[PDB]
Design an enzyme around this catalytic site. Structure first.
Site, PDB file in Angstrom:
ATOM      1  N   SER B 146       1.146  -1.196  -0.321  1.00 25.69           N
ATOM      2  CA  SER B 146      -0.414   0.364   0.222  1.00 25.69           C
ATOM      3  C   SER B 146       0.546   1.234  -0.102  1.00 25.69           C
ATOM      4  O   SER B 146       1.779   1.548  -0.677  1.00 25.69           O
ATOM      5  CB  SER B 146      -1.538  -0.051   1.638  1.00 25.69           C
ATOM      6  OG  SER B 146      -1.905   1.164   1.122  1.00 25.69           O
ATOM      7  N   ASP B 201      -7.931  -4.862  -6.174  1.00 26.69           N
ATOM      8  CA  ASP B 201      -6.695  -3.853  -4.413  1.00 26.69           C
ATOM      9  C   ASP B 201      -7.605  -2.574  -5.133  1.00 26.69           C
ATOM     10  O   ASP B 201      -7.705  -2.255  -6.475  1.00 26.69           O
ATOM     11  CB  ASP B 201      -6.001  -4.077  -4.156  1.00 26.69           C
ATOM     12  CG  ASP B 201      -5.249  -3.504  -3.411  1.00 26.69           C
ATOM     13  OD1 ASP B 201      -4.329  -3.567  -3.138  1.00 26.69           O
ATOM     14  OD2 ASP B 201      -5.962  -3.158  -2.786  1.00 26.69           O
ATOM     15  N   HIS B 258      -7.409  -5.420  -0.621  1.00 22.44           N
ATOM     16  CA  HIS B 258      -6.639  -4.879  -0.668  1.00 22.44           C
ATOM     17  C   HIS B 258      -5.784  -5.190   0.838  1.00 22.44           C
ATOM     18  O   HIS B 258      -4.688  -5.460   0.796  1.00 22.44           O
ATOM     19  CB  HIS B 258      -6.980  -3.133  -0.194  1.00 22.44           C
ATOM     20  CG  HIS B 258      -5.133  -2.655   0.041  1.00 22.44           C
ATOM     21  ND1 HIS B 258      -4.179  -2.432  -0.991  1.00 22.44           N
ATOM     22  CD2 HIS B 258      -4.575  -1.888   1.205  1.00 22.44           C
ATOM     23  CE1 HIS B 258      -2.794  -1.921  -0.860  1.00 22.44           C
ATOM     24  NE2 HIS B 258      -3.548  -1.656   0.088  1.00 22.44           N
TER      25      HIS B 258
END
Ligand SMILES: *[C@@H]1O[C@H](CO)[C@@H](O)[C@H](O)[C@H]1NC(C)=O
Ligand SMILES: *[C@@H]1O[C@H](CO)[C@@H](O)[C@H](O)[C@H]1NC(C)=O
Ligand SMILES: O=Cc1ccc([N+](=O)[O-])cc1
Ligand SMILES: O=Cc1ccc([N+](=O)[O-])cc1
Ligand SMILES: CCOC(=O)CC(C)=O
Ligand SMILES: CCOC(=O)CC(C)=O
Lengths: 269, 269
Positions: B146, B201, B258
């Site tokens: 991320s 994601d 995600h």
């Protein structure tokens, strides 16, 4: 090692137990499909499963859960959610045994669970019957994770006898009652209680045997670790009231193990 | 189908990204074993892996992360945490470009990333260089998930070409800059970038690209579901700047996807 069929059922009701936290039904009307966020309950989405009744923060104990019709599997399912914050709910957990002879002769049980169920017990009992009548052929199952396990176990012990088996699948449930109450669940008829535990999940280890609590036999014990997939070969039936070498070992417990029952539970991605 | 060995590298680095969040690092003493809660990083724990330098809330974008020494795999590993709560990070995502010609000329990358990096960039390059010195034959890897992936993929290009290769493994990384940036990342030598994606994601689809962002090539794209284990035949190699057939496709994104890269990432049980 359990049988494949039982391994399938355990998975299934594990995902119905997970749907109590991650299905989208805050105010979702009766009849809509049961879907979850985060692939929490795919075996459920794949069945023709729909809500019959959604409930939330109900009565004294603020109980939450739902009632599902499953046409594919031919089940009526009552699923009780555990606590929205297990860590705090663990921390605020009193160990106070109460008298339970409305349920059974000389049965001690924990005060808050026994309490919360009664509050909602009539409004839901009415709602099983209605469906059990509508689909006389479908297996009734009560299931739940964590607190939800406790609730489910107690409603089940309480609503059996009325001419339709109630099966109970519990996940990482806490002890519910005194050794007699244990006994009542080990031996009671009108259904089976399936008490599922994982590794050193802690919630099942509470309340302590040294506050007098016992565990109903038998126990189905998941040995595979946290974040590890489960196969029929990683589950051990452990025979005997308050037995040891299951979850009930004097090693150090753990909270993550509690949120891993055949997959993520107690939480929502 | 990627090779077994690249697959093993994907997993291991996923786990070093997960340790950003779930390790007991805080600021622990250097030379401590690396361990995580929640079975989050077992392949790290299996290795002789020890912190070199911890950091928490450092500089001008509370960058958090660690630098690790892995004698078993012969690695020096810098791992940057993404956001403590992601959805709140996504929401307030500022889409402002800035120029960093001191990385590549005419390059403009996300102001918030480059800006938190630069502010800590010195103190770290020193800490890495230090570690390259005592372990000259060890492979330097930057990793992250991320917004940790962001930092890693940027601290990457900036710190490369100073003698030593820098591999970068990123998991559900957002876009980090302009198309000029994409090519510099896509071509740059002395370290190869493995940009890993899962299903839909959300974090990799931001910024949108109509704020003026593009994606480096190639892309490694996990096509197996959320809470599903990843095998080798679930990973697909995807090429061409801003190509599509992977995360970058026109359907609804998911937050949960995600949080599932080889295991649970971005959150701690
Ligand atoms: C509900 O599921 C049934 C079968 O399981 C399906 O036919 C129907 O399309 C679904 N309803 C919605 C709104 O998806
Ligand atoms: C750290 O790990 C090493 C080997 O990986 C082991 O020998 C040592 O016991 C560990 N230290 C602690 C405190 O566990
Ligand atoms: O029962 C919890 C659970 C977790 C993950 C999954 N899954 O999607 O496989 C299913 C159930
Ligand atoms: O954790 C096992 C492991 C296996 C292979 C590799 N590698 O070859 O890079 C790394 C880690
Ligand atoms: C403090 C834990 O939160 C709850 O109790 C929520 C619940 C009972 O479901
Ligand atoms: C959204 C970014 O997450 C944070 O780090 C916020 C915080 C608690 O400091």
């Amino acid at each position: 090692e359990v049988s494949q069929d039982l391994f399938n059922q355990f998975n299934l009701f594990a995902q119905y137990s997970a749907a109590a936290y991650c299905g989208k039904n805050n105010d979702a009307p009766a009849g809509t499909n049961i879907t979850c966020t985060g692939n929490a309950c795919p075996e459920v989405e794949k069945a023709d499963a729909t809500f019959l009744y959604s409930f939330e923060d109900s009565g004294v104990g603020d109980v939450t859960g739902f009632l599902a019709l499953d046409n594919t599997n031919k089940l009526i399912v009552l699923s009780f959610r555990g606590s929205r914050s297990i860590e705090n709910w663990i921390g605020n957990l009193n160990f106070d045994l109460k008298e339970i002879n409305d349920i059974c002769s000389g049965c001690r049980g924990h005060d808050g669970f026994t309490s919360s169920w009664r509050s909602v017990a009539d409004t839901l009992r009415q709602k099983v019957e209605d469906a059990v009548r509508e689909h006389p052929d479908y297996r009734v199952v009560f299931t739940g994770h964590s607190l939800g396990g406790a609730l489910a176990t107690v409603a089940g012990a309480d609503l059996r006898g009325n001419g339709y088996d109630i099966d109970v699948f519990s996940y990482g449930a806490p002890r519910v009652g005194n050794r007699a109450f244990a006994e009542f669940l080990t031996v009671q008829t009108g259904g089976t209680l399936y008490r599922i535990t994982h590794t050193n999940d802690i919630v099942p280890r509470l309340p302590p045997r040294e506050f007098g609590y016992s565990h109903s036999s038998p126990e189905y014990w998941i040995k595979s670790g946290t974040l590890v997939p489960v196969t029929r070969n990683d589950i051990v039936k452990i025979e005997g009231i308050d037995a040891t070498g299951g979850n009930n070992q004097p090693n150090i417990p753990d909270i993550p193990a509690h949120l891993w029952y055949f997959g993520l539970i107690g939480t929502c991605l």
